[PDB]
Amino acid sequence: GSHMVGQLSRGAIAAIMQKGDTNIKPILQVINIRPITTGNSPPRYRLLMSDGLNTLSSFMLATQLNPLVEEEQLSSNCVCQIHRFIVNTLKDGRRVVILMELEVLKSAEAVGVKIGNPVPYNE
Ligand SMILES: Cc1cccc(-n2nc(C(=O)O)cc2-c2ccc(OCc3ccc(-c4ccc(C(=O)O)o4)cc3)cc2)c1
């Protein structure tokens, strides 16, 4: 409906990144999904997601959720709620947000556009 950015958990990305809040169940929009190079291991998908205010490109899908991508329920523009996630920190200090459980609330086709004008979150 009207006021589209009101559909997303504005501020959730900062909360995840600045506070390390892990109990929230934020509603985010998928902006993009891309496979990452794994080779011989099952594919892994990296997601660029939006909370309406920020985007963040450091989301990774748990392997168990691969069929959502492969069968196309989880795709660019869809709106989803993250029911479980974990943050992992790499040796170089970058952090990855692993999506363990997610629900697609509205299909890419039913949403159809990037919501609002989110700006890239920087670290
Ligand atoms: C900083 C950042 C954020 C998101 C993705 C990347 N990335 N981009 C590329 C690439 O070359 O495209 C490759 C990677 C990348 C980065 C880190 C990686 O390893 C970390 C990592 C990945 C997954 C898991 C994990 C825990 C539980 C599960 C599961 O259930 O599947 O998966 C735990 C740690 C794996 C891939 C980097």
Side-chain angles (χ1 to χ4, degrees):
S2 300
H3 178 41
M4 286 194 285
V5 70
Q7 299 299 280
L8 307 181
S9 289
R10 284 177 289 180
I13 284 173
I16 290 177
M17 291 274 116
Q18 295 166 7
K19 302 184 56 60
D21 196 336
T22 181
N23 291 284
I24 53 170
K25 292 174 189 301
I27 298 176
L28 304 177
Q29 179 176 44
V30 174
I31 299 302
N32 194 60
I33 310 181
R34 92 232 262 275
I36 63 186
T37 63
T38 48
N40 309 340
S41 304
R44 302 215 61 118
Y45 298 100
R46 180 174 182 168
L47 290 82
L48 175 64
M49 305 181 82
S50 161
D51 67 1
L53 274 185
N54 293 108
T55 63
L56 185 63
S57 65
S58 53
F59 290 93
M60 298 252 309
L61 200 64
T63 304
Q64 71 204 10
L65 298 185
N66 285 1
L68 302 185
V69 172
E70 270 133 31
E71 307 186 33
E72 308 179 62
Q73 284 96 348
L74 190 62
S75 67
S76 298
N77 294 331
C78 85
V79 167
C80 62
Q81 177 161 30
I82 309 303
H83 286 288
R84 187 161 64 99
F85 67 96
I86 65 163
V87 169
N88 201 49
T89 304
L90 309 193
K91 302 181 180 185
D92 59 21
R94 291 181 301 171
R95 282 176 169 163
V96 308
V97 181
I98 312 157
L99 304 175
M100 301 304 297
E101 287 185 352
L102 79 74
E103 165 181 10
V104 179
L105 297 178
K106 284 191 75 64
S107 72
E109 294 75 27
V111 185
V113 299
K114 174 170 72 171
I115 290 165
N117 296 272
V119 299
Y121 189 86
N122 289 309
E123 145 216 358

